[model samples]
Target: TCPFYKKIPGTGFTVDAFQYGVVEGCTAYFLTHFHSDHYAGLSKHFTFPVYCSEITGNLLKNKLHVQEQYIHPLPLDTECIVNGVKVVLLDANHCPGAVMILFYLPNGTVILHTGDFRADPSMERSLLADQKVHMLYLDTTYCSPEYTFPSQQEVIRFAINTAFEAVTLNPHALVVCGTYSIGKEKVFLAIADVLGSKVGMSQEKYKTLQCLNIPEINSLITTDMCSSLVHLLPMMQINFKGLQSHLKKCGGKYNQILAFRPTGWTHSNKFTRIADVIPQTKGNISIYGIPYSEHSSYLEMKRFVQWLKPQKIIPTVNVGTWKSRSTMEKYFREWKLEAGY
Candidate 1:
């Protein structure tokens, strides 16, 4: 389900890690970020040298326990060579230490693989150096016109307003937020700032937040769940049944639970919105799917492609071509024009 690796012809240069299950003869593996989806089966292969930003290298060493010798730390904007390939990392605003890779090939081709980014003005500055890119390995998670989310700043404002409103609506309800642990620190910090409260997080999530040194974005280890009204957890961990069980576990300590999920999928008409309602409610809990995301919107994706004008566009996720590879590539080219990319 994850098309996680790309190999350059005759060079043996690969992006991220091994493709799904295949791993053999790796001089160096260019790691873009710490997102597990980028390297899901990483623990299985600990032999190859992993090259990435210093922070990502630290994460690999501390979290995955990859031996320090196998990790090569690349400073941002510094060109370093590994196996005769020049590599430079740029900020990919998706998460802390996340990077968009620029690979300078021996054949004078520069390949930019934007490892899961939500395009913003800062990213625009990074690409303004006027370097022509050959191949673009795009993060096509939201690579369609249907996803038209507000800017990350606007979406964070919505999250903050929604969080405050949820608390106002049900004074006794525990306000809960769902997010990718590393993806959305700004949203939670906004919620805690105006509300003037601390966010309760898992030890792993809290440890990284402290390192960020952001003001008013405080969180304590979760010895007390109700110490603060807001509880933050990973996106997939907060389903309907999970919400019901949590309330029951609280033993009437909290009257109800107010939950919100920050995702691009809220664009679908399937989830009915409540007009003038803060967090759209289910039965006992109030629920909201905030139109918040990190990848380029359909139009942004198009703009990126037009600016780079890559020789080929590779969708990050599989778009179905069980028969021929060229068909999938051609289809995306057509889709790109229609979507204005």
Candidate 2:
């Protein structure tokens, strides 16, 4: 659960809108991103004139398929008065249409909500400036020292090299990788860019990526739609046999099919459970177990907190749980001043 909002016993300062209903005297309600965790209950229970960037609104309408009337869209960095509070949306480079909300109250108190953000130096430099933040709600999903991961570029290179090698080994076989709708789409584009050819995407993912100004990547597609070379959008229950059958029908015109799974191939318990029941099909299916996390790493989170230097840094998104909170506290005590701000 996001830590910015909590259900308190007597205090009326609870930031949670879903549980206690939008605070009575609250100035505004800001939705940092369109991720299901952030906006899941808004459409049904909470409708207090939500505020967010234009891109987020478009994503809700186009990608999430939410109605327009329910949204109050504003431009990035442009202040808007919602309900009575002034709010601004800043780019949060985690996802295609993700953002961080800056709330400036009438009393001159500034609250920055960094919802599921990552440490993109370029984005951070552009967003964090001379402004003084009274309270900072940070994301600490990977705030454990034990977790170390390679950069996205490095992982992409590895994936590309692996794919190339796999293709060389089994020229006649098909390869498929699984990934999420947004992150995996970029992986598909990167692979296509490396191969210097067009890749296919499901109609939904294609439309979503197109809206994010990735039309050139979408331009690459097979003349004849073959399931192997063509990138299929991720689905809940992936029909392996059906996909294999479709690839077989293609007659090996496109032997290699690369897919990515959003859930880390190692930590995904759901996928682990399904692996038992799902029959392993023929062809080379390489599981890219790269820990490509959207949230900030342990060190990155510490650096962000230090940079912000807030009096109390509230952890949100993947953090705020008992285990995560305890781990963060451990880092805080061990690192002392070096811990997150």
Candidate 3:
């Protein structure tokens, strides 16, 4: 039996083999994003066609490797009926393909499921002009007051400053950071903009960016052009020792080397050694710490909720009750409006 079915009460839902039996007969499952928790039991419980943004569909197909047969693509703000429920997709500026869903029932009850949205100014404007929402399902990854975040531009500036400082301090040292190919491409562009040159990208990253049709930002560069700056090498070309050897070999040629590791180095301490010990190679590798997170901050979330003014708020991803529910309740309470479930 699937672990998810254990949480459901008797007769409410059951798992016979990998499939689930639903008593309430849900119309359709609208996935907010491609994250694992949101899509875990999808193939089993909901055989009905799944709806999501085109980007979300592409990500799901690519990352989870799910076939197109199980997914339906819906653009932002497009409305359609599925199993008697009216559904629309709204922009959720959380991840690249994140979306917030609006479900309109026959009784005029409109429930907005915000997958994960940040309090971006543009996103707020979009929500304010949209249809009046009755309920909101939000992503409350960081609801606490202490969880503050800097703007994207601010983060870029920090990265650039750090890179520059590192280069200035240790001209022969290589400064490396980790980032994802799809998401953190902007950071590289920002670095290039600061450097007034094109930053080198791995072939995979270059291909991925091209496929996404990203607009050319200022100071962006291809990986092939990296030879002009630091030692040009593929992310897979060198391991830790190899990296040190490359730096040592090229130390006499270049004063400072700026390098980026592919994303997913944060899972272990072994990877941390690169950043920690690399500075020792040539006087010191200046590590620039920048606050560049993909998700929205608390301020951003509050702004989004204020714009939607939904009847009820539901939380997703992180601490739903503590962050999302409480935050929305506080907002309504301050406004002297009745907060719905």
Candidate 4:
């Protein structure tokens, strides 16, 4: 009975389709971000307009092979109609195109989908947070008190500076930074600025950034791996095996390689405040658990819930083996209504 799927009460709309792999009978569909988890099965849904942010929509049309006609761009802060539902898009702050979807239904209720976002204090004054949101389809990924981390800016600056320091300390080394497909563009841009050099990225990655039309962000891209002392590599290629082997084959020009992984996972079971920058890594590479989380941490989730004060919380994920539903009931505010069942 989660809002992620099926018809809503009265307005008659079905839901977020990636969970199902393909779009079939849903009355409407929405995509939050480019992360594989959000759109895993979306490629097969070709029968309708799949609403999402422009950058995300382009990638869906080009990379995932979704029909271009069905890709609808959801501009930030604009109100648009989808099958009579008054919808508005807001920046999610998770990635370049990630957005939170607001559906102003006719039933005097407003609902929100967090998409995948990191909460910012400024949201308090934003239109999305100021109003009353009846129900919330939450992103509970880091919704556990154990998952605390530092602010994304603090972490990225620390890591970038550390990488620069490595080069300053050891003139023979090059820095290899790891990031997901669209998540860490900020980390790369900051490094490019400090080193006064462009970040070397795969040509394909550069094209993806270009589709975003963000000039400030796009300025940091390059196709040549050896073009700069700092190379931004996909997360899959961040390991020593991926790094050393590539160097063995391509360019072993630098004697030492300093790897940096700026991710929130490093603090999944611990803590790091946004005001702090502490390194947790081996001698080979350094990892700083940054607050660049797309999903809210437990503390953030609590803060958000307190702000919105939704009538009910229906989690998007399945009621899995711990019977996930049972686990959720313990800490989450359950939806008591029988409207969408």
- Top TM-score: which candidate number? 4
Candidate models: Cα lDDT each: 0.69, 0.57, 0.54, 0.69
281 Cα displacement, candidate 4 (Å): 8.3
lDDT of 4 by residue, 71-109 (tens): 888778878988877988888778878888888888789
TM-score of candidate 1 on Cα atoms, chains taken together: 0.82
| Residue range 227-299, candidate 3, lDDT tens digits | 5343234445434554556556553665444555433213332344322323223332323334466676666
Candidate 4 regions with alpha-carbon error over 4 angstroms: 1-7, 19-25, 250-252, 267-292, 333-341
TM-score of each: 0.82, 0.76, 0.66, 0.84
Worst 10 residues of 1 by lDDT: 269-278
lDDT (0-100) at residue 90 of candidate 2? 81
Measured with C-alpha atoms, the lDDT of residue 196 in candidate 4 is: 75
* Runs of candidate 1 exceeding 4 Å displacement: 1-5, 19-25, 169-171, 207-224, 234-237, 251-253, 266-280, 322-341
Please provide, for model 1 over 19-130, each residue's C-alpha lDDT reduced to its tens digit, 9 standing for 90 to 100. Answer: 5454444467777788876766666247777778877776777676788777888888777777877777888877877898888888898888888887665565674366
Off by over 4 Å in 3: 1-27, 36-48, 127-130, 164-175, 196-211, 216-283, 320-341
lDDT of 4: 0.69
Looking at model 1, residue 86 earns an lDDT score of 77
